Structure 1
Amino acid sequence: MRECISIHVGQAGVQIGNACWELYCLEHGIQPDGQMPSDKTIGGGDDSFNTFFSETGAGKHVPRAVFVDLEPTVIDEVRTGTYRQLFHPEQLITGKEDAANNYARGHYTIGKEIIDLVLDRIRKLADQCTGLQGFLVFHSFGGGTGSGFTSLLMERLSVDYGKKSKLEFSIYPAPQVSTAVVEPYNSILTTHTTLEHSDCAFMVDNEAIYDICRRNLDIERPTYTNLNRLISQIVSSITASLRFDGALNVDLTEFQTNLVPYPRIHFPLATYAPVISAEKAYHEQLSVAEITNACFEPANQMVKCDPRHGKYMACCLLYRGDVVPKDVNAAIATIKTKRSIQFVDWCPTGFKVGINYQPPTVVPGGDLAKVQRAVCMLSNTTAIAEAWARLDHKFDLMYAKRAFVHWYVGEGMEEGEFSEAREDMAALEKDYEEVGV
């Protein structure tokens, strides 16, 4: 057994962590107080779920998690919230004042005074691990803390834990739920500095989640809570194979091997079906063929882009619920003849399938209805470079006039770091261009 530490940076990371650990607790049958009555080895063990939870002599199952925010307000709701007992205070780290939507204030100014504290609290979890394999980092591209402090953490984790893997759950910025005008700057800056330090990154465009919540859940104006509970389903599907008995994606190293041949191009597209409203009056249950087919509609993707115009390098199907291999192979055979699925010549046109029979769990009183079967496809497609092109253009428009740059320079950062970061992104868009033509 090999342990995994989850790190949650900024508001987005923290509030998405909440949604995830709440869901993990429901899936494994762990309570608000941390007691898991189904566990029989009291105060220890090396089961699949022990990858995400350590144990105390008292029988409590405590998340291998560190929540870090430069402002107390958000993490205080964790400290007083329904899962207050689940974490111990040293896991929940809060600063005094935030990075104010500024990468440079998060990375350089306020980052420096708190980085040693966090790495120390990370070391206090790593010393409880008999075989740490690495880290899952949750954050926003848009926030100052999420962009700035995260990239500093990822720099230092490569120094301290060089042999261990680092996965990212990144929230890509959208005007529909934006907190700042400079989020394109922060997104490019952090992607540049984090790129070589991150082994695999699952981007979630808030635009994509927002419209899924409008279109499929019938919610006029989605809150963060709506977006996060949907995000945590996608996260849970991706992490399920680390937390449950299986033979696909069993360690973090396998995510690199399966999904990431080119190391810079390490941004797999997640697609998820089906998303169904909890107070839909009459619902017809969707089959293996229908939900597998839904994995190739752009309207169900975590990032809106077009996989038809682009090439695949790898494709995972992660099923949860009533699914058998026979149905999956028959679904794939039908879809192959009707849709435009093109792999790169140097890769096999094929799918790694993983079924878990336990159907997806939903939060009681939530917006998501129970389903007999669901699926999360993880495809490394070049079509996700569309998200980079969008974001880089917005950067160019502002940076051409040096708009807002003085805020960054005023925290110690050099103007050079902007165009240095932008050149890397221009190279990244070229890396995608070559692979998919």
Structure 2
Amino acid sequence: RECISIHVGQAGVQIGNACWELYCLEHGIQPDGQMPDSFNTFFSETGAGKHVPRAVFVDLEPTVIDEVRTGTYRQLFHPEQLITGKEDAANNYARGHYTIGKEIIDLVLDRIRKLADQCTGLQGFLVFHSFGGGTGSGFTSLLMERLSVDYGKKSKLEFSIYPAPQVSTAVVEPYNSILTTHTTLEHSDCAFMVDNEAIYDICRRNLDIERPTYTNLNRLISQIVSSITASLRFDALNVDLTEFQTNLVPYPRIHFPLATYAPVISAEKAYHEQLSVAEITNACFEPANQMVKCDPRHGKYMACCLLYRGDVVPKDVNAAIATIKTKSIQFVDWCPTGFKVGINYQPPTVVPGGDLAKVQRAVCMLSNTTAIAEAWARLDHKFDLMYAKRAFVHWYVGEGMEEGEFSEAREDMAALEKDYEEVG
């Protein structure tokens, strides 16, 4: 039951690097594919013992993927599944979607088909990309449109980097974010947003890093991705991509679960006291541990999954949940108040060059809360400020896009925010 991971643009590629770095360590696969199988969902096996990720890396310029081709994992991936153009999208969604992106889209789909043809029962795709980049936004939306046509019954899941000014390199990222969300909403089944500012604060407050790098952010992001995808790579809950939709998305447009992760401990605190199931469960309802800055106390929950990893006894989870039920988290009246629970008994893994301490118990909570609409409103407000003066719009109109798509996208967002308000 195979899953293909696709990584688009700089953010998507570099987070892909971290994710597969963690995957290999968690499964005992060396950087050359050799291993001294549940993970066959994510790795094919050649007739020589080589375990190869079912993964594609795509960018419109070469320098980020060129590092994959020469780095520690230069022999892990299919070389033909590392695909680059020459001229990037210049932080312009229109270029990623309409002009530059179409020069390479057919090659990317033919290479994905090569992976797909090696699958006996393809479940679908995991797509990693930024909101703010021209490629992460434009080429991802183009790829999703094409994948829905060519793989009509396959699921598509998203890991999407929500922009933050602290590490932002483009004033137009609010445009690209709204444009890509408008054209992707129909084609994505479930999308896990990661707010760069949330990861930034965690690295500063929990890991004691003054100026977090992209490497620091990405090893922390890969830890949350890994806890989310472990059910697909190991043996109960969220066993296939469709089950993500069943458990987390009762309402098809409201498909943006909030991820919360605990504990996050600095590697300098190797001998920290070990937190109990109850303590790490309690930490899932502390806003400091959320992947998106918002306030679930002012929202309503539509679904809630708890994915535990490590030395975790089910009765201790059940007692910890009982506390949570009877102590201001509100569910909507049309879904079960219950909490779905997955337990992976493998100890959580940490990259040797990482900033995290080893922990005996970890948990990632995935909750579909209307409170995440606050993150949409922040982006939409920044969109409105610029578009009211038509600032930067000429760059997009000159690259194969019509100006009416701006307001068509913004009206979709307004309706999405309306969907959150009606449910909440």
TM-score (norm 2): 0.99
Shift of 1:179: 1.4
Q: 1:173-204 CA distances to partner (integer Å, 9 max, x unpaired)?
A: 00011010000000000000000000000000
Shift of 1:220: 0.3
Change (3 A) 1:33 1:281: closer
Matches of 1:278 and 1:424, distance apart in 2: 43
- 2:270/2:357 contact within 8 Å kept: no
Shift of 1:281: 6.3
Matches of 1:281 and 1:237, distance apart in 2: 21
Q: 1:61-99 CA distances to partner (integer Å, 9 max, x unpaired)?
A: 000000000000000000000011101210100000100
Alignment partner of 2:368: what SS?
A: strand
Shift of 1:282: 4.7
Greater shift after overlay, 189-198 or 278-287? 278-287
Matches of 1:128 and 1:194, distance apart in 2: 27
Change (3 A) 1:111 1:96: same
Match of 1:166 among 156, 174, 178: 156
Which residue in the other structure is 1:360 paired with?
A: 348
Structure 1 stretches (4+) deviating beyond 2 angstroms? 335-338
- 2:277/2:320 contact within 8 Å kept: yes
Alignment partner of 2:306: what SS?
A: strand
Greater shift after overlay, 345-354 or 280-289? 280-289
Alignment partner of 2:419: what SS?
A: helix
- 2:7/2:57 contact within 8 Å kept: yes
Matches of 1:111 and 1:402, distance apart in 2: 24
Shift of 1:335: 2.5
Match of 1:326 among 294, 300, 315: 315
Shift of 1:113: 0.6
Q: 1:188-247 CA distances to partner (integer Å, 9 max, x unpaired)?
A: 0000000000000000000000000000000000000000000001000010000001x1
- 2:192/2:259 contact within 8 Å kept: yes
Gaps of 5+ in 2: none
Q: 1:290-318 CA distances to partner (integer Å, 9 max, x unpaired)?
A: 10001001110000111111111100000
Q: 1:145-192 CA distances to partner (integer Å, 9 max, x unpaired)?
A: 000000000000000000100000000000011010000000000000
Shift of 1:401: 0.5
Matches of 1:214 and 1:425, distance apart in 2: 32
Shift of 1:124: 0.5
Which residue in the other structure is 1:44 paired with?
A: none
Alignment partner of 2:109: what SS?
A: helix
Shift of 1:365: 2.7
- 2:2/2:40 contact within 8 Å kept: yes
Matches of 1:155 and 1:143, distance apart in 2: 18
1:399 aligns with 2:384: no
Shift of 1:359: 1.1
Matches of 1:389 and 1:75, distance apart in 2: 34
Q: 1:375-403 CA distances to partner (integer Å, 9 max, x unpaired)?
A: 00000000000000000000000001000
Gaps of 5+ in 1: 38-46
Match of 2:261 among 272, 275, 290: 272
Matches within 5 A, 1:16-165: 16-37=15-36, 47-165=37-155
Which residue in the other structure is 1:12 paired with?
A: 11
- 2:270/2:358 contact within 8 Å kept: no
Shift of 1:112: 1.1
Shift of 1:332: 1.5
Matches of 1:66 and 1:341, distance apart in 2: 39
Which residue in the other structure is 1:307 paired with?
A: 296
- 2:131/2:163 contact within 8 Å kept: yes
